[PDB]
């Protein structure tokens with residue numbers, strides 16, 4: 001009988017954990033043309049838009065995070081605890097219960113309500129921008145999502161830098177490991193983050209506000225979740241809301257620095273902003289791989305059998321360059337009215353909780369920056385994030401206008 005899965009015989013191979021690998025290489029394009037799904041050593045990789053969108057919702061595929069933790073063999077400890085218990089690792093009743101307590105402030109209706117704050121914050125950040133060369137992350141891409149999360153979670157607004165610094169230094173992008181050197185840094189960062197969070201939580205336990213930390217504390221007083229679930233959930237929302245938005249904002253500037261004519265088009269027509277943001281999400285999603293799933297049962301799709309326990313990764317970046325769906329897919333173009341959205345936010349039960357908030361922050365940022373400033377220009381060497389997950393500039397030296 002068969003030595004390998006018969007339906008896997010023709011699947012193109014890709015190794016995204018290879019120093020020379022690029023999502024935009026011709027070999028990746030060839031793979032997507034040959035097959036809707038590629039084989040990697042440890043996981044199947046979905047490359048075409050239709051299947052990536054559909055399978056992220058497929059109930060036969062649950063969260064693969066716990067599978068990955070066992071795959072990398074993280075030892076028993078605080079880092080493993082967080083990685084196996086946090087929202088993205090859960091499914092069924094536990095997931096819907098915990099996600100449910102964090103949903104309210106992120107619903108489209110409630111995002112409308114925070115819009116005035118976002119616009120005012122963007123305006124203020126632009127008012128005090130430096131006038132020569134400067135780090136865009138330091139002066140805009142970091143402050144904006146840090147302040148927004150502080151506002152939503154009930155943290156003092158002057159704590160925005162500390163909160164941002166705390167999120168970065170958890171090094172959660174490096175947590176999928178069994179190396180002790182890395183795991184020391186991750187644990188130390190998580191501990192310091194929990195120090196701030198527990199202090200905020202204990203304060204809301206006695207004097208609650210209308211913020212999300214206060215909301216979750218009330219659920220804790222109603223016995224819906226325990227103390228550990230409480231702090232883990234707050235930590236989850238904070239980290240997931242900060243780094244992604246930060247890097248995506250920095251990628252937006254990078255995209256327009258490479259294509260400044262399109263910046264002038266938004267200045268000419270501010271109405272282009274939402275479409276422009278969606279193009280940034282299509283062209284350069286901060287999470288090239290969005291949904292990390294695992295087969296919960298044996299099933300078949302397009303004649304390819306996916307047995308129980310198969311890790312399945314949704315490759316948003318490659319799916320965004322699918323010419324079956326997007327016209328002139330490998331060209332950055334904000335002017336094209338597109339039928340299909342980006343799938344930068346994944347899908348299914350785990351679909352990004354702050355999707356509407358993310359689009360708001362990006363749209364408000366882009367619209368105001370383009371209306372008030374000249375096109376961005378790269379002003380020095382960029383420091384890129386070299387990790388699995390969040391991608392984009394950690395530091396972006398630039399100037400708005402040649403003079």
Ligand code: HEM
Nearest residue numbers: 087088240241244290291344345346347350352353354358
């Ligand atoms: C401040 C705004 C944001 C907030 C509050 C937020 C929050 C969250 C949370 C709590 C989760 C876990 C959901 C779950 O497991 O049930 C999540 C997942 C996710 N987020 Fe975000 N996020 C934000 C911005 C972004 C941005 C800018 C991107 C990239 C474009 C992004 C991409 C994703 C993806 C791809 C997932 C996984 C979805 C899946 O597995 O199907 N998020 N987010």
